[PDB]
């Protein structure tokens, strides 16, 4: 939309930042002692949008140190715990957003995952939401602030997904799905980062420069959803909501250790997001919500579906959320592609949960094989960016540079002609029928299908920036649309998760991702989760497996 | 076309001149301070065309010293960061003006580069575009001054390209090119200076006297456009449009330390230029911008052909100026075409660049040898005057003198029969065939071919006064019609660019330029500039090697 | 140059078709039936080349009569098609070239549209294109034979452009475009005929004797690429490459009712063909191919394009084969000149076209004026022969007779002196500038530009022999260097194209047309065709408007 030079618009853009940085410190009121630390943190911002600063080693450890109790007192509560307080007024609605303004506020710093504060909008909607008590205590999110992905419109904001040339793209309405949260008692309070051209699962662009893991600081915080992993994996928001079209959700939730679901397409609403490539229908993203909490991720889908948004939105089916009364399970553990192997990390992850569940009575538990993974690259190779990447490219006539990561996305993009794309829409129907016929092979003889497939988010734990060169352990489930939750699990161990020795790679990429894991110090205290993967609309499934995970 | 005795012409060429110094120095307005320095300043105009002043030493010291800051902040600053405060109306078109003329005017005393202000239409032309700020700041030059070759056609004035017997030769028109650049925000204000015939590689004639260079001058400013490497090498215009047939817009640019280039024909419009032979068609002569910003030459290029000239001009192809997305590059260097051996100072640029170019990882550097560099001066020879020097002899009817340079231009000229001029546009465009095999004879085996070659614009640094005995580092490629880019490397360093020892020349030609260079010390602080040379329509790779290059 | 005896070289150049007739009929193994029905042929080819045989009425009758289905089933195919059964192994590389072959003969004996057939490289091109199908079945057109008029050079044969002097200049080496169509899968098998000078729009040349027109064995098949047009008006060739100076591929396209691009200058790779006046550069000649299929005309163009022919041809434009995205449309309709009327048929042909386009919603039609139509004869009459035919006129040193045709086109040429080859060359470029700005004067008040006009190849249909004394319908292209597209429309009617009456003529010139025009029985089954001109570089427009005339 704009063609002004980007090194005026990069200004521009940490403007905004910095002014609403500015007033989220005059809300949060940072005593003496606080904003010594807070003044003596390693920043990943940088004094422009090509400087990514010098991130501490252990972010989240720095966080725990810099903030006072009366604020961990809060954000470090469970949120659905933090709702009954809520509730019975121990707490103020004010209080708790003055406290996680103060958590997002050092997150920022340390992890450069904010990319605009909301904290004029969040004191008018906390004030009213505790003068409203009375009437309103009730709702299911009562007093909950929440973080967005910044592509998700909010009234008065300019919508980007990171492109400087958006950057007077202002929108006098909220997504359907923020007003349905705020109609529950829930506000946001924060927008978080994301990158150029949404198709990385890292977390770089000229709006914000680079976002880091919130466990090591070495590493990425994942994408596209990278400021809400990191937000959220620092604890920092009761949850956020991103979007997920080859991984933007799981990624950034497995990099950062906590809970991230790619909800079946058609159950919450995600049309009215701002991304490149409007109008595109032959891959569709999703939503979904991000949190260190499984029951807060349970909670915002039972609370938006429950409102009937299908009644806002027509793309949406009126199937409820229920939790499954299953008291026994089927199992399948995806332990590889045989494209890429996973790293030590992530593998001892599927033995550990394996074993776990095998431990328990009612889980059955089958190795799950691969089904043609070489399709998803080929088929989602034409329809990511199905018009060539014209509609991206047109972004930099601003001069915006193009990011590394970028161009892995649009290499080879074709602009299709209708016969093509026709094609490769049969293409995808047929590979979706095939891999369904693939999962029901597993059915056993009672004729108990499988209920969900563990499997790994990416070959490693939270990768080294500018090698995100694989998404198939992600972008699989795009291409089918299942659902998929990504749960932690466990954390790299220096002594358990040693390179393999005398390993023999099985291709050109393989190779890259086996000397991609040097040793288990370059991924120290790095998170090492897995997802649980369902057939369309069984989400609810993947969390009541998922609760017993972690018991 | 016209017969008077030539001392009259010059006369009036001289009094053109003064009229428009004097209509200068009114609208500059400079204060006693500067209006005083500027009297004392050594002068580079004589009474005469034929008396050549006594130049200061390093003009450009003395025009450092001479202006004010006032003048200074605006001129010295690079023109695209100028056009922010153009446009951001921190600044006025009609204070820009002010500002350009007064340093046009130390420049023309101190250098000889000023053949006619424009002082006249310049404030015209300025005043009109401070007021429809609103409507035109979004044009991509807004407010910006440039130079003009004498050679490019302007209202109401006489194109003569140096020669007294065109005096008469009065125009209504401008060039498409000066149209176009109007049309985008710019406006000419000066006209600069260009030697008899065209053919030289300095810039000597009987309708201005003799343009010497910004940095040293005892030297030449190159040519034919030296006015433009002058005034541009003085700082005193953001940029100027010249003419390139032998070299003739990067000499000047080489020659003053800045950058020139001579785009692949049929990208920019240039046909309805003045000079000899008019109609001559076996070798045709390019235009192209020569300034100290490599972003403002950049700017320049996209700005005209994103105006369309194609419909206007149907020579010109419909390319549009495209930066390049390449990732890798190879590069060639052209160390010498071992018929005259370049200078020490030249020799140690090659150096400089050749090692800064292999620190970088992506640059892949290989030599580049020559292919029969001889045969450029027995083509040339024949078609750059192609009816024997009959078109030029006629314009000296005036009694005009014919100049030593201009004297080797001619020498040998034939005037061709059909058939003669048959054979050698054969021979033409086979070595224009063979040249390229041999280009992509430097493709490795993945099929990369060579993207540019490092080379030199001359044998020596800026040359002294009647020695630029040798074309070929710039005929070469006007032979070949590849567009090449002079840029920025050194200046002469006298502990470094001794002569060399007992040195064993390769050639009489070869000694001649050996024994002009006695000493780095009748080249002090000269700047010691390359090129870079690329296939036909790559332009733009150019643009992108030579950013690299300067970090 | 040769300087024996003329009578003697007819001789050898008979005996050199004849050779390779007898391996063609080998090549392509007739049974009885066939040699029977070939041999009871009216032939156009005498018993020397002054004699013209006897010409069949409705030559493409007696071919479509005398073949067998079995060759008819393939040469009758559109050739994109055709490509597809290449592709899927449903006919071998072999089995095409034997139908192809054999229809060329049909058409060599019916039209004598042959100059030499060749078989032998022929079939070593098609056996070793099926042995590789496995690795070059990927090529755009793998196996398709195509054929070349004789002016393209071809290894081990001689290139004469008809002139009997030549016999003994044999090449080693094939046209770029040649190598460039074999690199893609296809391979030259036939030699078509070529007339004297190459500056007649006819086909009559003392190598080959006459060729006739396709429908009507009475007319001539135009020129200068008359034995491409009778060819592959037969449909006995998938497509064939001519060159184009003054109509000499279009005039064959339109008399022969099939597609005939002359493409713009620089796209297509030409300068290696062989010619008259070699080295004149004044006014240069363009190659395209000339189809009965549209599509095969478009492949062949997007086929060499993409192949980047400007790395090995350096006067070539690095510019893509693009489909315009351009959905609607501004076109001009030429219906005269006003210095020579079109017949009745080709005046039926404009209407027909006009009401098509009009009927379209897309389509907004004008009616196209002429710009000094006068200009372009008195030009073309200085620069086609620059050398006042000096170079030609010694081609008859063997004493081969100056044919009335070849006479016109040398009448009054000028040996130019080089003041009047400059002189001329601006009034070339003039005229050039003056008539884009005319084109441009049909822009609307959006700023819609005229993207094609419609207008006659000639000012009639195939014309008698020895009447095509008007060129300036095809020639003023050929100045302005606009990208000509010659479509079919119609064929005469005998009810709808009588002759006018109470004509009055313009001028003697139109006074000779429409004499020339006694009745519509004289040129019964002519095609009646147009074109679609162009600004220059837009041919893909052209493509892409005849394409939806015939839909």
């Given at each position: ?34 904003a ?124 980007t ?21 705020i ?54 928001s ?19 250790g906590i ?24 891959i ?11 029951d ?122 209708m ?5 490769w829409?049969?293409?995808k ?18 004729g ?12 490693n ?19 089918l ?44 205290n ?26």
């Open positions: 939309m704009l063609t002004d030079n980007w090194k005026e618009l990069a200004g521009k853009a940490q403007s905004t930042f910095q002014k609403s940085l500015k007033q989220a410190i005059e809300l949060a009121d940072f005593d003496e002692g606080l010594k630390r807070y003044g003596a943190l390693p920043s990943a911002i940088g004094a422009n949008v090509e400087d990514f600063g010098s991130p501490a080693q252990f972010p989240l450890e720095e966080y725990l140190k810099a903030l006072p109790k009366k604020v961990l007192d809060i954000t470090e509560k469970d949120p659905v715990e933090l709702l009954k307080d809520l509730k019975s007024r121990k707490v103020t609605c004010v209080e708790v957003l003055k406290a996680y303004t103060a958590a997002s506020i050092v997150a920022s710093k340390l992890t450069n995952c904010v990319q605009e504060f909301l904290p004029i909008e969040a004191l008018q909607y906390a004030q009213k939401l505790d003068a409203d008590y009375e009437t309103k205590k009730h709702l299911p999110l009562y007093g909950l602030p929440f973080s967005i992905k910044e592509m998700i419109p909010f009234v008065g904001r300019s919508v997904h990171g492109s400087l040339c958006y950057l007077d793209r202002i929108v006098d309405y909220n997504a359907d799905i923020v007003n349905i949260l109609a529950n008692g829930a506000y946001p309070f924060v927008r978080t980062t994301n990158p150029q051209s949404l198709m990385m699962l890292e977390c770089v662009s000229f709006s914000h420069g680079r976002t880091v893991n919130a466990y090591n600081g070495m590493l990425t915080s994942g994408g596209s959803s990278g400021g809400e992993g990191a937000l959220n994996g620092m604890r920092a009761p949850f956020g909501l991103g979007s997920d079209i080859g991984g933007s959700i799981r990624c950034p939730a497995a990099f950062n809970y991230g679901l790619r909800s079946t397409l058609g159950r919450i609403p995600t049309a009215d997001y701002f991304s490149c490539n409007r109008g595109s229908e032959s569709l993203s999703v939503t979904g919500p991000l949190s260190r909490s499984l807060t991720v349970n909670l915002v889908m039972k609370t938006v579906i429950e409102a009937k948004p299908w009644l806002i939105d027509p793309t949406l089916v009126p199937l409820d959320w229920k939790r499954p009364e299953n008291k026994k399970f089927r199992v399948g553990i995806y332990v590889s592609d045989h494209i890429v192997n996973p790293s030590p990390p992530i593998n001892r992850a599927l033995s550990m949960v394996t074993e776990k569940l095998k431990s328990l009575g009612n889980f059955e538990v089958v190795t799950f094989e691969p089904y043609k993974p070489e399709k998803v690259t080929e088929i989602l190779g034409k329809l990511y960016f199905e018009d060539g990447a014209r509609d991206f490219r047109a972004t930099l006539q601003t001069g915006e540079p193009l990011l590394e990561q970028t161009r892995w996305a649009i290499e080879g993009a074709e602009d299709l002609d016969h093509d794309q026709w094609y829409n049969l293409q129907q047929a590979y979706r029928k095939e891999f369904l016929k693939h999962w029901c092979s597993y059915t056993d003889n009672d108990n299908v499988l209920d969900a497939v563990i499997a790994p988010v990416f070959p734990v939270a990768a080294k920036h500018e090698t995100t060169k694989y998404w198939t352990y992600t972008s699989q489930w795009n291409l649309d299942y659902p998929v939750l990504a749960f932690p699990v466990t954390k790299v161990d220096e002594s358990l998760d040693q390179p393999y020795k005398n390993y023999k790679p099985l291709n050109d990429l393989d190779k890259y991702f086996y000397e991609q894991y040097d040793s288990p110090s370059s991924f120290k790095a998170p090492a989760n897995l997802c649980l993967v369902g057939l369309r609309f069984t989400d609810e499934k993947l969390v009541e497996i998922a609760n017993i995970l972690r018991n």
